[PDB]
């Protein structure tokens, strides 16, 4: 129940505001740069901002921060999801999230800030459906807003019905220093980009630990996603029901469900690093790579992380595999690979000078983070059965997917 | 901008 | 070799604060890189950027050894590369000048003079207590010098050595002698700052130094009588520096002597009438002279004039014009204090003025004005600041209240109104430390308790949130219970204290969560005395204390373990050791 | 004499800076900041004097980037002002029609100006054309 | 081709599920 | 510039129009007031135009406040507007109707939100709800006057679900200003048509649908279980508001589920993947979630009992995430994870965040308080944080140990040799007092306690006054304990505290002591040196009232505050 939603600018400028009930006054926002400096400087900054009896939530944008004040107990929850949907919408709309764009497009963004919420209550979200009713470059709305499917636009017509769906596999570990993994979760990713004609019913169906239990066939190799979640064209109460995932799929790329479960098995990519630094004098970076993964499956683009220190300078590179460059504005050396076959052993021996004067205060041990993707790799095991693509008029689909297998958080904590 | 402009305009 | 120019260019080029700290690791790693090969072809450009990334705000640990190595060089831009990075990053604290203690020996005697100047203001700048006793011999040996443009950088070493070495200011006794004759403005200003920092060090060259009077009386006349400068001479003033360092010493020459005011007492009065105060330089003069008549003992003529000067000054609309005023007026507050009662109007006004610093000034000036026939007038004007007075300067207006109540309070009973009446008003703003001095106060005064502690109950039951007010009251009914309430011991007429109320009002405030843990052991402290010192609400407080035994804090909870076993076993001794603490000074 | 001597533009940039007293750098910064903070939160009817820590914090900015200066109790408050104007006056006449810019690209030769000028935070040259004869010679040699 | 995996056809059902 | 623009506005052509009024707003977005000119545009309002029927729109109700005078030549237009054949002009114009804060104003809009009440358009239908609603909030009376709460009631029995959503959101807006009086509460029909519709509501409609279900008090567990069947879907929407306003009505509606059913156990188990899709969240709803999973710890804590993995702070997390991740680990605490934790405890105490360190410090105290059976491992763990060489780390560490010994100081007596020399150079007040009351408490395993507190008493007058205090306690013990070896350095104490200490209350404490050692010095050991209670520690729990009040407001401001919906408003 925010008072009024505004864009401000890293200057403290507002980039365009609109009120939205009245209750608060617009000179508020001038006080928030100076409440979020004193945060800032004091380490009680946080993004929901209070400013007397009224509270101005803000979101770290791109180049502004998206202040909306709130003077009721509103909801927190709700300001957060109408702050997430107006940024997807502008960058729908706008390819770049600047101020370059915010004081270009105003004549449309007054607009489609006045058609996206009234009085603090947001009524149109579908990115798709404001820009068939508001264009930058107007007719009565669109009927699909009042309909209940406002997730797929009818009348679309195209000329081939071809669908490419994306299994996207974020690979996380959580290695502390002693060498145990202690957070290692693999969050599933299925979207899938359709374009076709009409507005068909996508029948989603995959190889489900819950699914093939139910069935009887619990015996093969079933995904077990501890948490599924649908999208919005998901039905949930098939779902619910007898996991039956039926939806009308929506025009263009869009995430159908995203599995989210633990891992139990062994990193993809197993990284020891050793930490030879002389008092003042050398540094030593033993760090050796093993890959865990199948051999038949590359790593494609393998940067493996490894902080350097923060003074270090002068640092000579000896390794096998893989080139290896010292960002200074990272302050870390990359173990980065252009192909990384899977059982490879990289090892690789880093020897820099240190200043004679000690560091005034401790930089940290950050983790050793690395970016390790090998597409066409199904660490979780889970194969999609068949997509039920269904259309009125009756057409024949050629949907696709591309399993790609990425680390996430696979971070591993600095000894 | 106004520091181009002189400290004391003499 | 990136160019200073270039790397500033850059750094404003960036626009994110995380670009530009990224730009700047990139730059200093670049400089390190260098400075670790021994580069010394283009080791000013990477001085200069090491040294923009300092003053931006960028850790400069490793840039420490370059500089050392570039201060022991030969190129003049590398020498003063290397003597700005000793000033700017270099420090007592850091310990890397140590090593540099040979490079300037070394550069004190080399024979061009901007060599041996830089490290001169070097050492200067960055003096050290070591540095300058192995340095001390060096600065007397350019003392004795007969160069114009080292004669001042010699004597600036010497102020800042005997600054720095107190005791190496003996060293420095014949060096100076015979000095007062130099034609250059600079050796002079030289040679007559340092002559007032040996005064003021210690009063052994007082009689030495003052017998130089003459010299400068002498010498400040010849500087009025020439009204015009081509050099040093700005706002029609000529000299303004070196008058004021005239004027200073006059101030400081002789103040405790007549024979040296005497002597000056004729240039002081051709001062302050054959200067004009138009300008900020003739004003400076003005107010400086007038400060050297009041710290001296000067005639009555001057005091007048000096007191007319200020009073003048006052009612000067400019603001710089009007803090200088009140400063004077504050600093000559026991002197001429008399003279000083006729600006009370001026005074309060200030206090009502729009600047902060001449707020300060007035309230100063008010609070130093306070005497004991104005300080009941007074207190009603200091009661109306402090209530509305700014966030800052409420704490400060209470404390000069209570300041002003015990030094000059014209009686007990008005000193304790309004001691009270800070307390009521002054909420949060009363300092914790002024709460001993308010508990001894009111220890010390035995003659006003009934009274007082009517008062302290009554507003002890109304609030309990101010943690000064709230540690007086408990303080108050712990010292005087048996005199707050009167037939208490059973039931009668409905009174302001019945017994039960005062008990209530101190387990709520023990048991409040507005407890810093202090206001909490004094009520916990009052509690446990009320068993003695009151009889009326018996057995009931054993049960609280053993309950209150069992607390958080270590403290706390031993104190109440304390009270419940001295409760539990010491009831016939509870008495013994609950007698009134004596009152002292 | 002058504690420390630092100028500072209206955004809060500093372009100068000049402590004569020996201060830990994170207290060095932390006081910096203050006083950044005091200025940028000051009128200009507040007289341009600030007793700030028991010191005469004394800013006075003729133009957009402003000058600040720490001097103790023991010296007028016009001496801190005039020393200010004729340290400007100078610069002025050394560089030729100073501005913001300039300052930053001469950090340098505005910090050697200041050392040539005053010296451990005492005036060390009271005629104004004597302090640029000698800086034009210290520049010319090389 | 394309990196992250070749788009690989998809069925329409379980047809050992009837 | 004015001049010109003005007279641009003044002009005939629809170009120079155009042009007049994104130069009016660009100046109004750039911070200009171009309030003055609000009059000129009013002639130029009435235009066939879209884009500047909009910003003439725009231009008023942002210059409505400011020029409620010249807003009286806009009714006109707005009842001209407010019957256009275009479903887009008349959203606009009932927008703007009700954005606009003239108390004259909206008496002459009854009319058109009377006759949009009634709008076919599900969009028209919205925007005549969300007009009825300001109208209302602006004037409850004129609302009620016009009688708009029936027509809001109705309009949730009709289609246009989205239509429904909002004027759902409008009736408990209304009602959430009204009095309590006349309320808006439905029937378990209503709750079962809101049901059917909540499947084909969006994403902003959904919440609106929850929203009634949340005030609404279940009375039968059939009824119950069909809300909990009905919002188990809700879990399983991409929605992080949605998924939180289900987990609301779910611990609501647990409120009177029987724990002897089926129902309750299958709600539990599946929370907890809810929990963890939601601590995966984006930063700006991080807190909130870990807010609402905090709120419902104290309600459910078996629900989250096997969520400790995912409570770990990430390294990239920000620190308002990582200090409600440590709450999270704190509260969530067990003898099962307690390695766990003090392992994740060790790792927080290496980073470069001071708060971070210290609250870190904080939740292993907690965690050695509240388990016993951690107790070794928390003073080991103690003991390498202040043998690590860290001046905060060494202060954590030392006021663990205080609040240990005072905790569980059965089995403290082997850290006392450890602890005696320790680096106690510290002047830290919270460390200082802690370490004195240690070496008081525990002066029996230390040969130089005497000595120990020698260096101490230097500054004992001017030391502080809890420090005083407990330099006081300390010296006393140790006399009541061992006076052979402390004779003298009682009395020093008692001389330093009675005559030079000018404290009241330590004053009074000084006299006291040296009235009991003066008395009967045996009585002072059992007096002073008294075997003291198990102390009570102080509960995290928040009361059971407030935490069924707290239930209900779920996803509000007052979660993320951890404050009363009625002690944060204003």
């Given at each position: 129940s925010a008072s009024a939603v505004y864009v401000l600018d890293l200057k403290g400028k507002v980039l365009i505001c609109r009120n939205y009930r009245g209750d608060v006054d617009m000179s508020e926002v001038e006080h928030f740069m100076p409440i979020l400096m004193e945060k800032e400087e004091e380490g009680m900054l946080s993004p929901i901002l209070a400013h007397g009896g009224v509270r101005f939530m803000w979101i770290k944008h791109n180049n502004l921060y998206l202040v909306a004040t709130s003077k009721k107990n509103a909801c927190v929850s709700l300001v957060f999801s109408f702050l997430y949907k107006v940024v997807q919408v502008f960058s729908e709309y706008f390819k770049e999230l600047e101020e370059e764009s915010i004081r270009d497009n105003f004549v449309i963004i007054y607009e489609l800030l006045d058609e996206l919420m009234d009085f603090g209550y947001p009524q149109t979200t579908d990115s798709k459906i404001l820009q068939e009713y508001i264009t930058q470059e107007a007719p009565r709305p669109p009927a699909t807003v009042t309909n209940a499917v406002s997730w797929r636009s009818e009348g679309i017509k195209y000329r081939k019905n071809e669908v490419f769906l994306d299994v996207i596999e974020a690979v996380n570990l959580l290695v502390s220093a002693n060498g145990n993994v202690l957070r290692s979760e693999i969050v599933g990713s299925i979207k899938m980009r359709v374009f076709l004609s009409g507005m068909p019913e996508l029948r989603l169906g995959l190889n489900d630990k819950v699914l093939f239990d139910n069935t009887g066939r619990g015996k093969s190799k079933s995904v077990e996603l501890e948490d599924v979640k649908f999208h919005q064209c998901v039905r949930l109460s098939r779902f619910e029901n007898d996991r039956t995932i039926s939806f009308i799929p929506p025009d263009g790329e869009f995430e159908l469900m995203s599995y989210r479960l633990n891992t139990h098995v062994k990193p993809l990519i197993w990284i020891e690093s050793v930490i030879e630094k002389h008092s003042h004098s050398r540094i030593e970076y033993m760090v050796k790579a093993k890959s865990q993964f199948k051999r038949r499956s590359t790593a494609n683009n393998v940067e493996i992380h490894i902080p350097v220190p923060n003074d270090a300078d002068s640092p000579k590179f000896k390794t096998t595999v893989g080139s290896v460059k010292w960002v200074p504005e990272n302050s870390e050396i990359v173990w980065s690979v252009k192909s990384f076959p899977g059982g490879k052993e990289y090892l690789m021996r880093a020897h820099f000078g240190l200043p004679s004067v000690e560091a005034e205060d401790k930089e940290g041990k950050p983790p050793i983070s690395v970016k390790f993707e090998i597409p066409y790799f199904t660490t979780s095991g889970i194969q999609v059965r068949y997509l039920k693509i269904i259309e009125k008029s009756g057409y024949q689909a050629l949907p696709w997917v591309r399993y790609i297998t990425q680390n996430g958080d696979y971070q591993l904590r600095t000894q | 901008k106004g520091e181009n402009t002189s400290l004391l305009h003499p | 070799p990136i160019r200073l120019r270039e790397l500033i260019r850059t750094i404003r080029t960036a626009r994110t604060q995380a670009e530009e700290r990224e730009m700047i690791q990139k730059e200093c790693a670049a400089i390190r890189s260098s400075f670790r090969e021994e580069d010394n072809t283009y080791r000013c450009r990477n001085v200069a950027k090491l040294l923009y990334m300092h003053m931006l705000g960028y850790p400069a640990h490793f840039g420490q050894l370059e500089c050392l190595k570039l201060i022991a060089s030969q190129k003049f831009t590398d020498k003063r590369i290397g003597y700005l990075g000793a000033m700017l990053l270099?420090?007592?604290?850091?310990?890397?000048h140590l090593l540099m203690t040979n490079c300037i020996k070394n550069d004190l005697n080399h024979s061009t003079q901007f060599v041996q100047g830089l490290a001169l203001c070097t050492l200067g700048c960055m003096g050290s207590s070591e540095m300058c006793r192995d340095l001390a011999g060096e600065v007397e040996k350019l003392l004795k010098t007969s160069n114009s443009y080292l004669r001042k950088k010699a004597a600036l070493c010497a102020v800042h050595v005997i600054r720095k070495v107190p005791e190496l200011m003996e060293m420095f006794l014949p060096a100076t002698k015979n000095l007062l004759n130099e034609k250059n403005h600079g050796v002079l200003h030289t040679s007559v700052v340092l002559l007032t920092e040996m005064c003021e060090r210690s009063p052994d060259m007082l009689a030495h130094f003052r017998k130089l009077v003459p010299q400068l009386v002498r010498i400040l006349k010849n500087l009025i009588m020439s009204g015009y400068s081509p050099e040093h001479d700005v706002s029609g003033i000529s000299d303004p520096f070196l008058q004021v360092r005239i004027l200073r010493l006059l101030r400081i020459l002789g103040r405790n002597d007549d024979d040296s005011s005497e002597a000056m007492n004729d240039i002081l009065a051709q001062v302050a009438t054959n200067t004009e105060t138009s300008k900020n330089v003739g004003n400076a003069i003005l107010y400086e002279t007038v400060l050297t008549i009041m710290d001296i003992k000067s005639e009555s003529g001057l005091r007048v004039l000096a007191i007319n000067i200020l009073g003048r000054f006052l009612l000067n609309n400019d603001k710089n014009i009007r803090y200088v005023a009140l400063t004077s007026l504050l600093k000559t507050v026991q002197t001429d204090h008399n003279a000083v009662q006729r600006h009370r109007s001026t005074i309060v006004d200030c206090l009502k003025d729009l600047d902060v610093s001449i707020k300060r000034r007035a309230m100063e000036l008010s609070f130093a004005l306070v005497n004991g026939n104005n300080i009941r007038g007074m207190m009603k004007e200091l009661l109306y600041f402090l209530d509305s007075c700014e966030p800052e300067f409420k704490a400060d207006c209470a404390s000069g209240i209570f300041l002003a109540a015990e030094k000059y309070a014209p009686s007990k009973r008005w000193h304790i109104d309004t001691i009270m009446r800070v307390l009521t008003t002054a909420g949060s703003y009363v300092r914790d430390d002024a709460v001993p001095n308010l508990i001894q106060l009111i220890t010390n005064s035995?003659?006003?308790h009934a009274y007082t502690v009517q008062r302290l109950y009554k507003a002890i039951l109304g609030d309990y949130s101010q943690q000064p007010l709230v540690q007086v009251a408990a303080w108050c009914i712990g010292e005087y219970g048996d005199l707050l309430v009167s037939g208490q011991c059973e039931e009668e007429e409905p009174i302001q204290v019945t017994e039960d109320e005062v008990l209530d009002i101190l387990e709520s405030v023990l048991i409040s969560n507005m407890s810093t843990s202090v206001t909490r052991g004094y009520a916990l402290t009052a509690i446990m005395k009320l068993s003695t010192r009151f009889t009326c609400t018996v057995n009931r407080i054993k049960k609280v204390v053993s309950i209150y035994g069992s607390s958080i804090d270590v403290e706390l909870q031993q104190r109440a373990v304390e009270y419940n076993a001295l409760f539990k076993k010491y009831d016939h001794m509870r008495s013994a050791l609950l007698e009134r603490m004596p009152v002292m000074e | 004499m002058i504690h420390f001597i630092l100028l500072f533009s209206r955004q809060g940039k500093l372009r100068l800076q000049k402590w004569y007293i020996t201060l830990p750098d994170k207290e060095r910064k932390k006081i910096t900041r203050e006083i950044v903070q005091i200025i940028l939160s000051r009128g200009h009817r507040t007289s341009s004097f600030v007793d700030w820590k028991e010191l005469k914090l004394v800013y006075k900015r003729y133009a957009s980037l402003y000058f600040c200066c720490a001097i103790e109790?023991?010296?007028?408050?016009l001496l801190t002002l005039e020393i200010v104007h004729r340290y400007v006056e100078l610069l002025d006449k050394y560089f030729g029609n100073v501005c913001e810019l300039d300052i930053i690209f001469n950090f340098e030769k505005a910090y050697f100006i200041l050392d040539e000028f005053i010296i451990g935070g005492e005036i060390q040259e009271t005629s104004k054309k004597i302090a640029v004869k000698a800086i034009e010679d210290s520049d010319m040699l090389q | 081709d394309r990196k992250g995996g070749s788009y690989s056809q998809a069925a329409g059902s379980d047809s050992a599920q009837s | 510039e004015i001049f010109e623009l003005k007279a641009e506005l003044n002009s005939d052509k629809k170009e120079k129009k155009k042009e007049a009024v994104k130069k009016v707003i660009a100046s109004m977005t750039v911070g200009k007031d171009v309030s003055a000119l609000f009059p000129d545009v009013v002639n130029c309002m009435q235009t066939d135009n879209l884009e500047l029927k909009k910003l003439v729109y725009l231009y008023l109700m942002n210059y409505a406040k400011s020029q409620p005078d010249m807003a009286i030549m806009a009714v006109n237009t707005f009842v001209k507007d407010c019957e256009d054949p275009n479903p887009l002009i008349r959203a606009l114009a009932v927008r703007t109707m009700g954005c606009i804060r003239v108390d004259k104003i909206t008496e002459y809009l009854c009319e058109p939100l009377r006759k949009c009440l009634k709008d076919e358009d599900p969009y028209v239908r919205k925007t005549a709800a969300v007009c009825v609603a300001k109208l209302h909030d602006i004037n409850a009376q004129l609302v009620e006057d016009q009688g708009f709460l029936d027509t809001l009631k109705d309009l949730i029995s009709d289609s246009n679900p989205m239509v429904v959503a909002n004027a759902v959101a409008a009736l408990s807006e209304i009602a959430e200003s009204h009095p309590s009086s006349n309320l808006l509460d439905l029937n378990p029909q209503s709750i079962n048509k809101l049901l059917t519709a909540l499947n084909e509501c969006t994403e902003w409609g959904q919440i609106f649908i929850l929203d009634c279900l949340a005030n609404y008090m279940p009375k039968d567990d059939r009824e119950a279980q069909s809300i909990c069947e009905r919002v188990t879907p809700r879990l399983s929407h991409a929605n992080s508001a949605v998924v939180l306003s289900a987990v609301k009505v779910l611990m609501k509606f647990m409120e009177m589920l029987s724990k002897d059913l089926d129902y309750y156990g299958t709600l539990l188990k599946k929370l907890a993947p809810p929990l963890v899709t939601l601590l995966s969240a984006e930063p700006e709803l991080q807190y909130v979630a870990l807010r609402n999973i905090n709120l419902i710890v104290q309600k459910r804590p078996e629900i989250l009992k096997h969520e400790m993995k995912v409570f770990f702070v990430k390294y990239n997390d920000p620190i308002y995430v990582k200090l409600e991740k440590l709450d999270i680990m704190i509260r969530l605490a067990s003898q099962a994870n307690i390695a766990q934790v003090l392992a994740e405890l060790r790792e927080y105490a290496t980073e470069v965040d001071v708060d971070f360190v210290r609250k870190a410090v904080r939740a292993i105290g907690r965690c050695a308080i509240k388990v016993e059976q951690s107790a070794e491992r928390c003073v080991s763990t103690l003991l390498d944080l202040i043998q690590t060489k860290v001046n905060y780390v060494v202060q954590e560490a030392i006021v663990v140990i205080k609040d240990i010994f005072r905790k569980y100081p059965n089995k403290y007596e082997s850290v006392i040799a450890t602890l005696c020399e320790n680096l106690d150079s510290l002047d830290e007040p919270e460390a200082r007092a802690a370490m004195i009351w240690i070496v008081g408490e525990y002066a029996e395993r230390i040969d130089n306690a005497d000595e120990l507190l020698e260096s101490f008493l230097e500054g004992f007058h001017d030391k502080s006054t809890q420090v005083q205090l407990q330099l006081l306690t300390a010296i006393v013990k140790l006399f009541l304990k061992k006076p052979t070896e402390t004779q003298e350095l009682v009395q020093q104490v008692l001389s330093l505290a009675t005559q030079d200490s000018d404290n009241p209350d330590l004053r009074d404490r000084g006299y006291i002591y040296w009235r009991l050692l003066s008395t009967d010095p045996v009585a002072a050991k059992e007096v002073v040196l008294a075997e003291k209670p198990l102390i009570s520690e102080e509960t995290d729990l928040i009361e059971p009232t407030l935490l069924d009040e707290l239930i209900c407001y779920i996803g509000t401001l007052a979660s993320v505050y951890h404050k009363p919906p009625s002690a944060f408003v204003e």
């Amino acid at each position: 129940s925010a008072s009024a939603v505004y864009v401000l600018d890293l200057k403290g400028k507002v980039l365009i505001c609109r009120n939205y009930r009245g209750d608060v006054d617009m000179s508020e926002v001038e006080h928030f740069m100076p409440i979020l400096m004193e945060k800032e400087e004091e380490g009680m900054l946080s993004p929901i901002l209070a400013h007397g009896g009224v509270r101005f939530m803000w979101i770290k944008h791109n180049n502004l921060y998206l202040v909306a004040t709130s003077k009721k107990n509103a909801c927190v929850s709700l300001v957060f999801s109408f702050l997430y949907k107006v940024v997807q919408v502008f960058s729908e709309y706008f390819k770049e999230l600047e101020e370059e764009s915010i004081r270009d497009n105003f004549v449309i963004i007054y607009e489609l800030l006045d058609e996206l919420m009234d009085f603090g209550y947001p009524q149109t979200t579908d990115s798709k459906i404001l820009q068939e009713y508001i264009t930058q470059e107007a007719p009565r709305p669109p009927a699909t807003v009042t309909n209940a499917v406002s997730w797929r636009s009818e009348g679309i017509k195209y000329r081939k019905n071809e669908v490419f769906l994306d299994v996207i596999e974020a690979v996380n570990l959580l290695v502390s220093a002693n060498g145990n993994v202690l957070r290692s979760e693999i969050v599933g990713s299925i979207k899938m980009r359709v374009f076709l004609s009409g507005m068909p019913e996508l029948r989603l169906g995959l190889n489900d630990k819950v699914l093939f239990d139910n069935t009887g066939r619990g015996k093969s190799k079933s995904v077990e996603l501890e948490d599924v979640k649908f999208h919005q064209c998901v039905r949930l109460s098939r779902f619910e029901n007898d996991r039956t995932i039926s939806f009308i799929p929506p025009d263009g790329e869009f995430e159908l469900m995203s599995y989210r479960l633990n891992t139990h098995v062994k990193p993809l990519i197993w990284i020891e690093s050793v930490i030879e630094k002389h008092s003042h004098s050398r540094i030593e970076y033993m760090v050796k790579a093993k890959s865990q993964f199948k051999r038949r499956s590359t790593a494609n683009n393998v940067e493996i992380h490894i902080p350097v220190p923060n003074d270090a300078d002068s640092p000579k590179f000896k390794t096998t595999v893989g080139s290896v460059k010292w960002v200074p504005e990272n302050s870390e050396i990359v173990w980065s690979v252009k192909s990384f076959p899977g059982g490879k052993e990289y090892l690789m021996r880093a020897h820099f000078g240190l200043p004679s004067v000690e560091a005034e205060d401790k930089e940290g041990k950050p983790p050793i983070s690395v970016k390790f993707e090998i597409p066409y790799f199904t660490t979780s095991g889970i194969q999609v059965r068949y997509l039920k693509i269904i259309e009125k008029s009756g057409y024949q689909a050629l949907p696709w997917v591309r399993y790609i297998t990425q680390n996430g958080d696979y971070q591993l904590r600095t000894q | 901008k106004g520091e181009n402009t002189s400290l004391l305009h003499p | 070799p990136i160019r200073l120019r270039e790397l500033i260019r850059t750094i404003r080029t960036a626009r994110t604060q995380a670009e530009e700290r990224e730009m700047i690791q990139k730059e200093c790693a670049a400089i390190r890189s260098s400075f670790r090969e021994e580069d010394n072809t283009y080791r000013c450009r990477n001085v200069a950027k090491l040294l923009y990334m300092h003053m931006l705000g960028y850790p400069a640990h490793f840039g420490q050894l370059e500089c050392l190595k570039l201060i022991a060089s030969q190129k003049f831009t590398d020498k003063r590369i290397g003597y700005l990075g000793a000033m700017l990053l270099l420090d007592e604290r850091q310990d890397v000048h140590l090593l540099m203690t040979n490079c300037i020996k070394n550069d004190l005697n080399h024979s061009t003079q901007f060599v041996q100047g830089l490290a001169l203001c070097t050492l200067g700048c960055m003096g050290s207590s070591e540095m300058c006793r192995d340095l001390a011999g060096e600065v007397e040996k350019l003392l004795k010098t007969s160069n114009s443009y080292l004669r001042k950088k010699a004597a600036l070493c010497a102020v800042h050595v005997i600054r720095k070495v107190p005791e190496l200011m003996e060293m420095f006794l014949p060096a100076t002698k015979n000095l007062l004759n130099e034609k250059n403005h600079g050796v002079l200003h030289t040679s007559v700052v340092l002559l007032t920092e040996m005064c003021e060090r210690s009063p052994d060259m007082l009689a030495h130094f003052r017998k130089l009077v003459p010299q400068l009386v002498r010498i400040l006349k010849n500087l009025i009588m020439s009204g015009y400068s081509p050099e040093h001479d700005v706002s029609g003033i000529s000299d303004p520096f070196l008058q004021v360092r005239i004027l200073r010493l006059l101030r400081i020459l002789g103040r405790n002597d007549d024979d040296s005011s005497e002597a000056m007492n004729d240039i002081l009065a051709q001062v302050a009438t054959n200067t004009e105060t138009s300008k900020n330089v003739g004003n400076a003069i003005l107010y400086e002279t007038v400060l050297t008549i009041m710290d001296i003992k000067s005639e009555s003529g001057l005091r007048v004039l000096a007191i007319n000067i200020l009073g003048r000054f006052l009612l000067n609309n400019d603001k710089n014009i009007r803090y200088v005023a009140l400063t004077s007026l504050l600093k000559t507050v026991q002197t001429d204090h008399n003279a000083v009662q006729r600006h009370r109007s001026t005074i309060v006004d200030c206090l009502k003025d729009l600047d902060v610093s001449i707020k300060r000034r007035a309230m100063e000036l008010s609070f130093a004005l306070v005497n004991g026939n104005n300080i009941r007038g007074m207190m009603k004007e200091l009661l109306y600041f402090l209530d509305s007075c700014e966030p800052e300067f409420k704490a400060d207006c209470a404390s000069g209240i209570f300041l002003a109540a015990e030094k000059y309070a014209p009686s007990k009973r008005w000193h304790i109104d309004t001691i009270m009446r800070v307390l009521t008003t002054a909420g949060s703003y009363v300092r914790d430390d002024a709460v001993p001095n308010l508990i001894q106060l009111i220890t010390n005064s035995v003659e006003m308790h009934a009274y007082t502690v009517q008062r302290l109950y009554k507003a002890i039951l109304g609030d309990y949130s101010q943690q000064p007010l709230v540690q007086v009251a408990a303080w108050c009914i712990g010292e005087y219970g048996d005199l707050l309430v009167s037939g208490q011991c059973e039931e009668e007429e409905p009174i302001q204290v019945t017994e039960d109320e005062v008990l209530d009002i101190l387990e709520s405030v023990l048991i409040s969560n507005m407890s810093t843990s202090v206001t909490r052991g004094y009520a916990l402290t009052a509690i446990m005395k009320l068993s003695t010192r009151f009889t009326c609400t018996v057995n009931r407080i054993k049960k609280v204390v053993s309950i209150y035994g069992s607390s958080i804090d270590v403290e706390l909870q031993q104190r109440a373990v304390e009270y419940n076993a001295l409760f539990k076993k010491y009831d016939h001794m509870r008495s013994a050791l609950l007698e009134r603490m004596p009152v002292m000074e | 004499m002058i504690h420390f001597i630092l100028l500072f533009s209206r955004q809060g940039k500093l372009r100068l800076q000049k402590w004569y007293i020996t201060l830990p750098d994170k207290e060095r910064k932390k006081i910096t900041r203050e006083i950044v903070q005091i200025i940028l939160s000051r009128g200009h009817r507040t007289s341009s004097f600030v007793d700030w820590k028991e010191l005469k914090l004394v800013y006075k900015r003729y133009a957009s980037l402003y000058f600040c200066c720490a001097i103790e109790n023991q010296d007028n408050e016009l001496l801190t002002l005039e020393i200010v104007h004729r340290y400007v006056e100078l610069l002025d006449k050394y560089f030729g029609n100073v501005c913001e810019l300039d300052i930053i690209f001469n950090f340098e030769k505005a910090y050697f100006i200041l050392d040539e000028f005053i010296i451990g935070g005492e005036i060390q040259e009271t005629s104004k054309k004597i302090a640029v004869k000698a800086i034009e010679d210290s520049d010319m040699l090389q | 081709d394309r990196k992250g995996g070749s788009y690989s056809q998809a069925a329409g059902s379980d047809s050992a599920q009837s | 510039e004015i001049f010109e623009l003005k007279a641009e506005l003044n002009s005939d052509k629809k170009e120079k129009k155009k042009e007049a009024v994104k130069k009016v707003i660009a100046s109004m977005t750039v911070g200009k007031d171009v309030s003055a000119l609000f009059p000129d545009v009013v002639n130029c309002m009435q235009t066939d135009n879209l884009e500047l029927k909009k910003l003439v729109y725009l231009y008023l109700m942002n210059y409505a406040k400011s020029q409620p005078d010249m807003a009286i030549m806009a009714v006109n237009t707005f009842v001209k507007d407010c019957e256009d054949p275009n479903p887009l002009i008349r959203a606009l114009a009932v927008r703007t109707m009700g954005c606009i804060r003239v108390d004259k104003i909206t008496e002459y809009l009854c009319e058109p939100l009377r006759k949009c009440l009634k709008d076919e358009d599900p969009y028209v239908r919205k925007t005549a709800a969300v007009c009825v609603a300001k109208l209302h909030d602006i004037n409850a009376q004129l609302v009620e006057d016009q009688g708009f709460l029936d027509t809001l009631k109705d309009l949730i029995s009709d289609s246009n679900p989205m239509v429904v959503a909002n004027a759902v959101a409008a009736l408990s807006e209304i009602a959430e200003s009204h009095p309590s009086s006349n309320l808006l509460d439905l029937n378990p029909q209503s709750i079962n048509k809101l049901l059917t519709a909540l499947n084909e509501c969006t994403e902003w409609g959904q919440i609106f649908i929850l929203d009634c279900l949340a005030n609404y008090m279940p009375k039968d567990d059939r009824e119950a279980q069909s809300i909990c069947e009905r919002v188990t879907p809700r879990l399983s929407h991409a929605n992080s508001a949605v998924v939180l306003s289900a987990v609301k009505v779910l611990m609501k509606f647990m409120e009177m589920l029987s724990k002897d059913l089926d129902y309750y156990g299958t709600l539990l188990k599946k929370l907890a993947p809810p929990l963890v899709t939601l601590l995966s969240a984006e930063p700006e709803l991080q807190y909130v979630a870990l807010r609402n999973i905090n709120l419902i710890v104290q309600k459910r804590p078996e629900i989250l009992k096997h969520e400790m993995k995912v409570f770990f702070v990430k390294y990239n997390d920000p620190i308002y995430v990582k200090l409600e991740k440590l709450d999270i680990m704190i509260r969530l605490a067990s003898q099962a994870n307690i390695a766990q934790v003090l392992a994740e405890l060790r790792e927080y105490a290496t980073e470069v965040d001071v708060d971070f360190v210290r609250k870190a410090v904080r939740a292993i105290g907690r965690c050695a308080i509240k388990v016993e059976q951690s107790a070794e491992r928390c003073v080991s763990t103690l003991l390498d944080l202040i043998q690590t060489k860290v001046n905060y780390v060494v202060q954590e560490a030392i006021v663990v140990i205080k609040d240990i010994f005072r905790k569980y100081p059965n089995k403290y007596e082997s850290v006392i040799a450890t602890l005696c020399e320790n680096l106690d150079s510290l002047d830290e007040p919270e460390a200082r007092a802690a370490m004195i009351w240690i070496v008081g408490e525990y002066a029996e395993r230390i040969d130089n306690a005497d000595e120990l507190l020698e260096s101490f008493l230097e500054g004992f007058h001017d030391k502080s006054t809890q420090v005083q205090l407990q330099l006081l306690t300390a010296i006393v013990k140790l006399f009541l304990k061992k006076p052979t070896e402390t004779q003298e350095l009682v009395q020093q104490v008692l001389s330093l505290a009675t005559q030079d200490s000018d404290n009241p209350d330590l004053r009074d404490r000084g006299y006291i002591y040296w009235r009991l050692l003066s008395t009967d010095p045996v009585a002072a050991k059992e007096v002073v040196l008294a075997e003291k209670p198990l102390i009570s520690e102080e509960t995290d729990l928040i009361e059971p009232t407030l935490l069924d009040e707290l239930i209900c407001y779920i996803g509000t401001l007052a979660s993320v505050y951890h404050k009363p919906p009625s002690a944060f408003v204003e």
